[PDB]
Structure formats: structure tokens, C-alpha cells
């Protein structure tokens, strides 16, 4: 085995769990400026699961912790953009509380 701090398939398993648990699909794709024009004025450092998947497959995440950090940013961004108590915010809060366990479930070191 490679015995290393980047585990590509483990990171993809992590993203697959996040994807599947994202019932609103609110994390699935980058936000189009034409569809939701205010988003980019509120969220200046966007990230989404498709972009994270692209990065994992390309190798442009150094380590599994870097993937975890981008998922944390993804969640924080959704908590910023959406209003407390909204369905979106509820889902993002659920992710905040569980994403590290999802990483562990996937085989990553947290
Ligand atoms: C991707 O489309 C949206 C995403 C929204 C949204 C409204 C739209 C939307 C839709 C759908 N049709 O017109 C508009 C405007 N309003 C709030 C909100 N909060 C939020 O996190 N999103 C994300 C990006 C999203 C993506 C896909 C499905 C559901 N939600 C959204
Ligand atoms: Cl609010
Ligand atoms: K908010």
C-alpha cells in the first residue's frame, strides 16, 4: 500500500456520502450567476461537491484533511448564504454536525 495522507478513493467515498445525503441537491453544483445572481456577492469563496470531486480526481488536494477543510468551508458558506431555520440551513446544520463522522466512515483520518 501507499501508506499516505491522501487517499483518493476514500475522499470520493466521502463526497459520495455527502452527495447522497444532500437531498436538496444544494451542494451538488456550482451556482450559476444567471440563476441566482446574489450568491456570488455574499459568498466570495464558493465550493461545491462537483468541484471537490474534480479536484480529488485531478489530485489537486494535497491530503485528505484538505478535502475535509473544503467540505467544512462548503457547509459554512451554506450557513452564511441561507437564513437560520430555512430548509437549506437545516440541512447544512445537519452536515456541520456529521461531516467528520462521514469522513471517518469513508476511511479518512480526521
Ligand atoms: C439552483 O437554483 C437555486 C438554488 C437556490 C435557490 C434558488 C434556486 C433557483 C431555482 C431552482 N430556480 O430559480 C432559482 C433562483 N434559493 C436558495 C438557495 N440556497 C441554496 O443553498 N441554494 C443552492 C445553490 C441550491 C442548489 C440546488 C438546489 C437547491 N438549492 C439555493
Ligand atoms: Cl439569518
Ligand atoms: K445566514
Numbering used by the authors: 5 to 114
Task: Quote the study that presented this structure, word for word.
Trypanosoma brucei is a unicellular, protozoan parasite and the causative agent of Human African Trypanosomiasis (sleeping sickness). Here, we report that acetyl-lysine (AcK) recognizing bromodomain proteins maintain the BF cell fate in trypanosomes. The T. brucei genome contains five genes with predicted bromodomains, and we hypothesized that these proteins may play similar roles in maintaining the parasites in their BF and preventing differentiation to the PF. Consistent with its more widespread genomic localization, knockdown of Bdf3 increased transcription for more of the VSGs in the genome than was the case for Bdf2. These results imply that while both proteins maintain monoallelic expression of VSG genes, Bdf2 has a more specialized role in maintaining silencing at ESs.
Using the recombinantly expressed and purified bromodomains from T. brucei Bdf2 and Bdf3 (Tb927.10.7420, Tb927.11.10070, respectively), we performed isothermal titration calorimetry experiments and confirmed direct and specific binding of I-BET151 to their AcK recognition sites, as mutation of two conserved residues in the AcK sites abolished interaction with the inhibitor. To provide a blueprint towards designing high-affinity trypanosome-specific bromodomain inhibitors, we determined the crystal structure of the Bdf2 bromodomain in complex with I-BET151 at 1.25Å resolution. The overall structure adopts the canonical bromodomain fold comprising four α-helices linked by variable loop regions that form the ligand binding site. Unexpectedly, but consistent with the reduced affinity, the ligand is flipped by roughly 180° with respect to the human BRD4-BD1-I-BET151 complex and cannot adopt its classical binding mode. In Bdf2, the dimethylisoxazole ring is solvent-exposed, while recognition of the conserved Asn takes place through a bidentate hydrogen bond to the imidazolone moiety. The new orientation is probably due to a clash of the pendent pyridine ring with the large trypanosome gatekeeper residue Trp92, which dominates ligand recognition through parallel π–π stacking and which is not found in any of the 61 human bromodomains at this position. The flipped binding mode is further enforced by the narrow AcK binding slot that cannot accommodate the energetically favorable twist of the dimethylisoxazole with respect to the quinoline ring. Notably, the pyridine moiety forces the imidazolone to sit high up in the AcK binding pocket, resulting in an imperfect fit with a gap at the bottom of the pocket that is filled by an additional, unconserved water molecule (Wat1). However, the negative electrostatic surface potential of Bdf2 markedly differs from the slightly positively charged BRD9 pocket, highlighting the distinct character of the Bdf2 AcK binding site, a prerequisite for developing a trypanosome-specific drug.
